[PDB]
Design an enzyme around this catalytic site. Structure first.
Site, mmCIF file in Angstrom:
data_model
loop_
_atom_site.group_PDB
_atom_site.id
_atom_site.type_symbol
_atom_site.label_atom_id
_atom_site.label_comp_id
_atom_site.label_asym_id
_atom_site.label_seq_id
_atom_site.Cartn_x
_atom_site.Cartn_y
_atom_site.Cartn_z
ATOM 1 N N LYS A 1 41.493 54.807 48.712
ATOM 2 C CA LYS A 1 42.577 55.626 49.234
ATOM 3 C C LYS A 1 42.056 56.698 50.171
ATOM 4 C CE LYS A 1 45.336 54.633 45.138
ATOM 5 N NZ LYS A 1 45.719 55.264 43.873
ATOM 6 N N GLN B 1 46.544 59.927 39.550
ATOM 7 C CA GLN B 1 45.961 58.610 39.345
ATOM 8 C C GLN B 1 46.143 58.222 37.881
ATOM 9 O OE1 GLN B 1 44.584 56.726 41.824
ATOM 10 N NE2 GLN B 1 44.143 55.064 40.336
ATOM 11 N N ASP C 1 53.813 58.329 45.302
ATOM 12 C CA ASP C 1 53.749 57.156 44.443
ATOM 13 C C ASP C 1 55.118 56.674 43.943
ATOM 14 O OD1 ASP C 1 51.187 56.080 44.440
ATOM 15 O OD2 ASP C 1 50.504 57.048 42.575
HETATM 16 N N1 21V Z 1 47.688 51.722 36.814
HETATM 17 C C1 21V Z 1 47.015 51.320 37.897
HETATM 18 N N2 21V Z 1 46.437 50.078 37.845
HETATM 19 C C2 21V Z 1 45.780 49.483 38.904
HETATM 20 O O1 21V Z 1 45.298 48.349 38.779
HETATM 21 C C3 21V Z 1 45.742 50.286 40.107
HETATM 22 C C4 21V Z 1 46.322 51.556 40.053
HETATM 23 N N3 21V Z 1 46.968 52.106 38.978
HETATM 24 N N4 21V Z 1 46.226 52.360 41.136
HETATM 25 C C5 21V Z 1 45.523 52.005 42.366
HETATM 26 C C6 21V Z 1 45.570 50.504 42.646
HETATM 27 C C7 21V Z 1 44.734 50.153 43.897
HETATM 28 C C8 21V Z 1 44.155 48.731 43.820
HETATM 29 C C9 21V Z 1 43.420 48.287 45.065
HETATM 30 C C10 21V Z 1 42.324 47.437 44.990
HETATM 31 C C11 21V Z 1 41.646 47.040 46.131
HETATM 32 C C12 21V Z 1 42.048 47.485 47.384
HETATM 33 C C13 21V Z 1 41.314 47.137 48.641
HETATM 34 O O2 21V Z 1 40.676 47.984 49.257
HETATM 35 N N5 21V Z 1 41.381 45.868 49.064
HETATM 36 C C14 21V Z 1 40.181 45.078 49.293
HETATM 37 C C15 21V Z 1 39.872 44.258 48.045
HETATM 38 C C16 21V Z 1 41.066 43.392 47.654
HETATM 39 C C17 21V Z 1 41.517 43.516 46.224
HETATM 40 O O3 21V Z 1 40.795 43.888 45.289
HETATM 41 O O4 21V Z 1 42.765 43.167 46.089
HETATM 42 C C18 21V Z 1 40.314 44.171 50.510
HETATM 43 O O5 21V Z 1 40.546 42.957 50.431
HETATM 44 O O6 21V Z 1 40.148 44.832 51.650
HETATM 45 C C19 21V Z 1 43.149 48.329 47.460
HETATM 46 C C20 21V Z 1 43.820 48.723 46.316
HETATM 47 C C21 21V Z 1 45.184 49.717 41.389
#
Ligand code: 21V
Ligand code: NAP
Ligand code: NAP
Lengths: 295, 287
Positions: B55, B99, B124
């Site tokens: 983030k 978070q 959120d």
């Molecule tokens: N309760 C709770 N559970 C959760 O599982 C989460 C949150 N809160 N809050 C935040 C949320 C964010 C999850 C996330 C994971 C990865 C990415 C990300 O940067 N993407 C990458 C990796 C892809 C992936 O892991 O999906 C990419 O392909 O570029 C972006 C967001 C996950």
């Protein structure tokens, strides 16, 4: 073999009798405690006068103190807000509602008015905060709007467990369909919500072990659409002229009762089903608010 | 022949590029103004650390100022409330989030914490006020949670109109499933919501022209259950003997017309949507 008829007039009378006993007993357990409801009215509509006096009468029979504040047609939005604020802050008042629609010569934002109601006193359950709690599964202490509350009670009167049933809700209004969805989901039904843009509505309706209809479309849901053995809950109140009746009009539901009664296992008639539940449900919500304040 | 792949990584990159330009333009219109986001963390979970860093990185690339407050595991509910109050009252902060899940040795009522957030800063979309607006169809004036938002955007990338479709949502959480239902319903789908007590899940799934899964049960939704030609949106992030979705991808891809991979589907879209909500909060404050 034809559906058992859920008699809302008898069930509601039982609920109001039980609430009376509970209220008698709260006052003996905690002397001086007085469950209290207020109804805020703007203007002087005939229909609102009638509905309010029905609510006040039920409350008095139960031993709830009911206060009616009737503001004139000249009232402004700012004066309505001041009364809402005063009701919120009055620790003698456990629950209150604003009777709708408002009858003023001035423009008043109805939504802003309703949303100034403190959530813990919102016995009609229509504040955004209360809807949000209900919609996300906080059923232990949010308020539930009176019509869907009465629907859930009717369903439970069948003795058939809700969990795992496929429920269908036809309609998604703030007052009925949406909160009805929420109650069914948090009682562990698998829920399908239909509306005016649902394709093949008949085939959707026919998947419902539990069916609640709240469309305002007289008798549109035909008996053929009902799943055999379904619980059918009909919220519709539709007027149709009929010179064979005492007042020259019949009330019919959103469901074609005479054919649906041959397919369902339990069905609400109209009149005499969902309608008479509604005032009892307001009284039950008023009593819940008073019990929570007593902690 | 396989389903078209909804590439959340490429779509999110396009969204972040657009938001960057929007932010660059706000700064030229009003020099010195900086959209600002804060993320409040309790404890020190590894996964939360990583999601927060993702983030922060997206925010910095867009030109949003991002602040991270990390409170210790000894934190009490009352201490968390003091920070929420300070963030509400800080007029330099346009949007903030807490978070989840909180990582404390003490019991903290998560809902009470979230519901102290001022609604205009609740990027959120997890306050009761915002949920209540979304749940009743008043989308004019609320923040929508970032995961369902990202899912809706993926669905729209197919070009297939939502209205009149039978949608199925597997899961009903506050963060994903419940709001996902609401978004689909107010875009005029007929929506079925399933959960752990749904009987005959396979037959429910098989009615979905649109299917969104958010269960946290690795690959439990089988390809056989997918309606031929369906749009399949998979929110799952599960660690397994690699990361996998809540959907059995290799079999679902042979039935669906559009599918999100995991990783690289819903996850990146969620972060982009948070940034879009943050930028909207900064723009609203500018009036
Ligand atoms: N309760 C709770 N559970 C959760 O599982 C989460 C949150 N809160 N809050 C935040 C949320 C964010 C999850 C996330 C994971 C990865 C990415 C990300 O940067 N993407 C990458 C990796 C892809 C992936 O892991 O999906 C990419 O392909 O570029 C972006 C967001 C996950
Ligand atoms: N006894 C009581 O005190 C009580 C209380 C409240 C209501 N009611 C009665 O319940 C009925 C509905 O009231 P409401 O407040 O829910 O009314 P409403 O606000 O008009 O809602 C109508 C709902 O039904 C849907 N609908 C309309 N035509 C449809 C169709 N052809 N197929 C499928 N869905 C359709 C609408 O869809 P869209 O959302 O797509 O527009 C909407 O969601 C009325 O008869 C009313 O008098 C009784
Ligand atoms: N990509 C992102 O940005 C992001 C963001 C948030 C979440 N997620 C991921 O999405 C997944 C779900 O997350 P969440 O926060 O919604 O999780 P959650 O709160 O654990 O909720 C899981 C939901 O799935 C239901 N479910 C569980 N087992 C089921 C079964 N066998 N059949 C049907 N439904 C079942 C649960 O039912 P009950 O309600 O009956 O318990 C519940 O509603 C996780 O893998 C999570 O990491 C991803």
């Amino acid at each position: 073999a034809p559906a058992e008829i859920l008699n809302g007039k008898e069930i509601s009378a039982q609920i109001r009798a039980r609430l009376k006993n509970q209220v008698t007993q709260l006052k003996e357990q905690v002397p001086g405690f007085t469950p209290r409801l207020a109804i805020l009215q703007v203007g002087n509509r005939d229909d609102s006068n009638l509905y309010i006096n029905v609510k006040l009468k039920a409350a008095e029979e139960i031993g709830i103190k009911a206060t009616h504040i009737k503001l004139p047609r000249t009232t402004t939005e700012s004066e309505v807000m001041k009364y809402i604020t005063s009701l919120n802050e009055d620790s003698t008042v456990h629950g209150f509602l604003v009777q709708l629609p408002l009858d003023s010569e001035n423009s008043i934002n109805t939504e802003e008015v309703i949303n100034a109601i403190a959530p813990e006193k919102d016995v009609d359950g229509l504040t955004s905060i209360n809807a949000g709690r209900l919609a996300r599964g906080d059923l232990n202490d949010c308020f539930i709007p009176c019509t869907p509350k009465g629907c859930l009670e009717l369903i439970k009167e069948t003795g058939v467990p809700i969990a795992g049933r496929h429920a269908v809700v036809v309609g998604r209004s703030k007052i009925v369909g949406a909160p009805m969805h929420d109650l069914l989901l948090w009682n562990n039904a698998t829920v399908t919500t239909c509306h005016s843009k649902t394709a093949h509505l008949d085939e959707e309706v026919n998947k419902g072990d539990i069916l609640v209809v709240a469309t305002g479309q007289p008798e549109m849901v035909k008996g053929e659409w009902i799943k055999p053995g379904a619980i059918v809950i009909d919220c519709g109140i539709n007027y149709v002229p009929d010179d064979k009746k005492p007042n020259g009009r019949k009330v019919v539901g959103d469901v074609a009762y005479d054919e649906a009664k041959e397919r369902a296992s339990f069905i609400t008639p109209v009149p005499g089903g969902v309608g008479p539940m509604t005032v009892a449900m307001l009284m039950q919500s008023t009593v819940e608010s008073a019990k929570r304040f007593l902690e």
